[PDB]
Short mmCIF file of C-alpha atoms in Angstrom, two decimals:
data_model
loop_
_atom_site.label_atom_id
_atom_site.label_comp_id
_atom_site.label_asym_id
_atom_site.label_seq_id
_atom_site.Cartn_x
_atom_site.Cartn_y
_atom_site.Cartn_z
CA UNK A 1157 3.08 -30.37 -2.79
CA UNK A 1158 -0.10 -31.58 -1.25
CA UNK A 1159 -1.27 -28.25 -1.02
CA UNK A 1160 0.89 -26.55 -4.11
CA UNK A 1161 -0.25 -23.14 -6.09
CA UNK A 1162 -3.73 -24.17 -5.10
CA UNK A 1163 -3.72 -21.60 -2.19
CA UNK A 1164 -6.17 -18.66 -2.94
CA UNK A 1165 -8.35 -17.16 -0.75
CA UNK A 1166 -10.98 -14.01 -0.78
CA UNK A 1167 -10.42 -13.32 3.18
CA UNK A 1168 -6.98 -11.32 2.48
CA UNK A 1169 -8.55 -8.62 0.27
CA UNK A 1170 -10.67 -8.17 3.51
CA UNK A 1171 -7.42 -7.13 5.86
CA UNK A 1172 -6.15 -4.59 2.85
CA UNK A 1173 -9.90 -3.03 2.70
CA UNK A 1174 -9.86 -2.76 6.46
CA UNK A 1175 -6.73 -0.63 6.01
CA UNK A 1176 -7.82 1.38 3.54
CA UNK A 1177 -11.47 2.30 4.65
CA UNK A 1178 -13.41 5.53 3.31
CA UNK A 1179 -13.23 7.89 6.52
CA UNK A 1180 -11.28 11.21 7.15
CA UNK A 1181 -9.58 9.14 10.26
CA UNK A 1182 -6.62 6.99 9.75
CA UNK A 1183 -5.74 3.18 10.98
CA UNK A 1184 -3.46 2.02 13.84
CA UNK A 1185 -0.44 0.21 12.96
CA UNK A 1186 -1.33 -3.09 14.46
CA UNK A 1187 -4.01 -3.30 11.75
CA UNK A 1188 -1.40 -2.60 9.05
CA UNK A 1189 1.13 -5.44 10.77
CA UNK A 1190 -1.18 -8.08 10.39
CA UNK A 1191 -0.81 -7.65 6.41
CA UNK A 1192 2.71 -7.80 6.62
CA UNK A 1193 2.60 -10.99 9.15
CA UNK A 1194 0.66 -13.06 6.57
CA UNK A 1195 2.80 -12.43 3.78
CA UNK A 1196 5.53 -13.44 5.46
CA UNK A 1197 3.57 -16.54 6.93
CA UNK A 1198 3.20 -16.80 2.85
CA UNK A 1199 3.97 -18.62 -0.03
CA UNK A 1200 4.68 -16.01 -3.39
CA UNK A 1201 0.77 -17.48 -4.76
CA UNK A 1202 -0.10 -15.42 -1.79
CA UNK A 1203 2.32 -12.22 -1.95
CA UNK A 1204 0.61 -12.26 -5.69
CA UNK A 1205 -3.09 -12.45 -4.24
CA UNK A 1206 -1.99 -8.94 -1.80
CA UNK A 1207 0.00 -7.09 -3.56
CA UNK A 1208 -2.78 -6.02 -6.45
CA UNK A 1209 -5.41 -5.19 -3.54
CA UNK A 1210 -2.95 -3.27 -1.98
CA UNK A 1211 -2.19 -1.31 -5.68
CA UNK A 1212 -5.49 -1.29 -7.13
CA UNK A 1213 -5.94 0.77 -4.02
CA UNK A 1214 -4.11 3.39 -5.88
CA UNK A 1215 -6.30 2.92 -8.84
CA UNK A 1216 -9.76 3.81 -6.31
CA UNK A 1217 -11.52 6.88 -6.28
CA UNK A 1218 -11.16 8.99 -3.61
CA UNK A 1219 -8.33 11.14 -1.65
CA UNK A 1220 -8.93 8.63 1.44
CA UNK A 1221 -8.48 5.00 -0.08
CA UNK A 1222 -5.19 6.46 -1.41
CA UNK A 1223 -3.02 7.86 1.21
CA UNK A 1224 -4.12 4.96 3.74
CA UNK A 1225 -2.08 2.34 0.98
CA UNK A 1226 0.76 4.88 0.62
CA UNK A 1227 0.63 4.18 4.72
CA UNK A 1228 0.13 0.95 4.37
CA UNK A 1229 2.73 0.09 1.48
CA UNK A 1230 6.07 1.28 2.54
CA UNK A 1231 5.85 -0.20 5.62
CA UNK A 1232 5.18 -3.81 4.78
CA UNK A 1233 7.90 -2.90 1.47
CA UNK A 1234 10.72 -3.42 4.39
CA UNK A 1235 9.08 -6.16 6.46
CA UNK A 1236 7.50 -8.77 3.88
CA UNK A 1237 10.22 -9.98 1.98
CA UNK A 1238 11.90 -10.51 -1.80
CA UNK A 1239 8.64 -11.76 -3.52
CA UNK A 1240 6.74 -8.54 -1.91
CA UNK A 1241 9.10 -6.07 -2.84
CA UNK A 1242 9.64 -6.65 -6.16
CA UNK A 1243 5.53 -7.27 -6.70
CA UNK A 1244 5.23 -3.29 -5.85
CA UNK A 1245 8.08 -2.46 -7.91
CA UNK A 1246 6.10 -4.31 -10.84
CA UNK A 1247 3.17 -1.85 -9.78
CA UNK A 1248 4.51 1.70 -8.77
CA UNK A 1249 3.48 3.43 -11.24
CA UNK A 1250 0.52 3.84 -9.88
CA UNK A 1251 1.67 5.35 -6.75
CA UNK A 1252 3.96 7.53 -8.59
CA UNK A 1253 0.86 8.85 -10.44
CA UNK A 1254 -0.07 10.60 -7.35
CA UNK A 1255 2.96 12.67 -6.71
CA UNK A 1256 0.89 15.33 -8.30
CA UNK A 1257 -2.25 14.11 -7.31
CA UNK A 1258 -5.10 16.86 -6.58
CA UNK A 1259 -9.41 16.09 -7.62
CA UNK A 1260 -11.27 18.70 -5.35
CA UNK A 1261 -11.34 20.21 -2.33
CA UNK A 1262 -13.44 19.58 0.73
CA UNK A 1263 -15.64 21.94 2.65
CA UNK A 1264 -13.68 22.15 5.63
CA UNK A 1265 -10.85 19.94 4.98
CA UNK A 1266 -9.93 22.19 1.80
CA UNK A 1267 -7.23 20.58 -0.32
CA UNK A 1268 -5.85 18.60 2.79
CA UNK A 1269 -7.26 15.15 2.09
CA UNK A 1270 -5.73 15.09 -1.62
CA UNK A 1271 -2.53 16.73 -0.65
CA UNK A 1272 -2.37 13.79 2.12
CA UNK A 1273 -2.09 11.14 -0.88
CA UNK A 1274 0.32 13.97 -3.18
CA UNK A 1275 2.94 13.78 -0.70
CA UNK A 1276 3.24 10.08 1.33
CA UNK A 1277 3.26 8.62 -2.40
CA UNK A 1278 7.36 9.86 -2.72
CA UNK A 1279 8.05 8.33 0.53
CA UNK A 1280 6.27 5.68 -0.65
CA UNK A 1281 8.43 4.94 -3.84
CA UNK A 1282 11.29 5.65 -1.31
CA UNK A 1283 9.91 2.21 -0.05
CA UNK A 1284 9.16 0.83 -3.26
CA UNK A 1285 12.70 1.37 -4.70
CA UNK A 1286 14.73 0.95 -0.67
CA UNK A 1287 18.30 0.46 -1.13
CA UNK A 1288 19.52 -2.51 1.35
CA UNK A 1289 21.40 -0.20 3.35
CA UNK A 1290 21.49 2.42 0.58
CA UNK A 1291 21.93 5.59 2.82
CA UNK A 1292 24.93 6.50 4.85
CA UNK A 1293 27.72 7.34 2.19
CA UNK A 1294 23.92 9.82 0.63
CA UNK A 1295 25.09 13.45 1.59
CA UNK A 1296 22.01 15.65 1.44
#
């Protein structure tokens, strides 16, 4: 239009990093939300922008920076919208490469910080690949 695909910005890799910070603690929700609200206050340039620094997540090195996008992911998966949705599914491979996810242990955390990520990536792709509706008739 005026303003057309010419709609970057740096800033939203910030909100995703904020998320996804290097600490044994864990984010509030209302920190997560505001990721969601944008890319629905968004144009599909912008769902583009978010979606790899929400997956390359996946790709980082540590236990932490992992499980905080697996967090992070399903929950704007059935909030966002079409563009968003389908932008993980293009991506989820890298999620599902954590299902068996393990590196070391920690001193006093043992194996709990990797087994954190090896689990909340299936309910992740439970996100990733939601069914509008797609439960109810499921038995077991």
């Amino acid at each position: 239009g005026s303003s057309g695909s010419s709609g970057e910005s740096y800033w939203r890799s910030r909100m995703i990093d904020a998320v996804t910070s290097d600490e044994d603690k864990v984010a509030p929700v209302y920190k997560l939300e505001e990721i969601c609200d944008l890319l629905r206050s968004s144009h599909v340039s912008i769902v583009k922008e978010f979606s790899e620094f929400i997956l390359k997540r996946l790709d980082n090195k540590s236990p932490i920076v992992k499980q905080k996008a697996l967090r992070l992911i399903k929950y704007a998966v059935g909030k966002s919208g079409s563009e968003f949705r389908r932008e993980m599914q293009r991506n989820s491979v890298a999620v599902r490469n954590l299902f068996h996810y393990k590196g070391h242990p920690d001193p006093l955390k043992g194996d709990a910080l990797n087994k954190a990520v090896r689990e909340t990536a299936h309910e992740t792709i439970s996100a990733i690949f939601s069914e509008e509706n797609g439960s109810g008739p499921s038995s077991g």
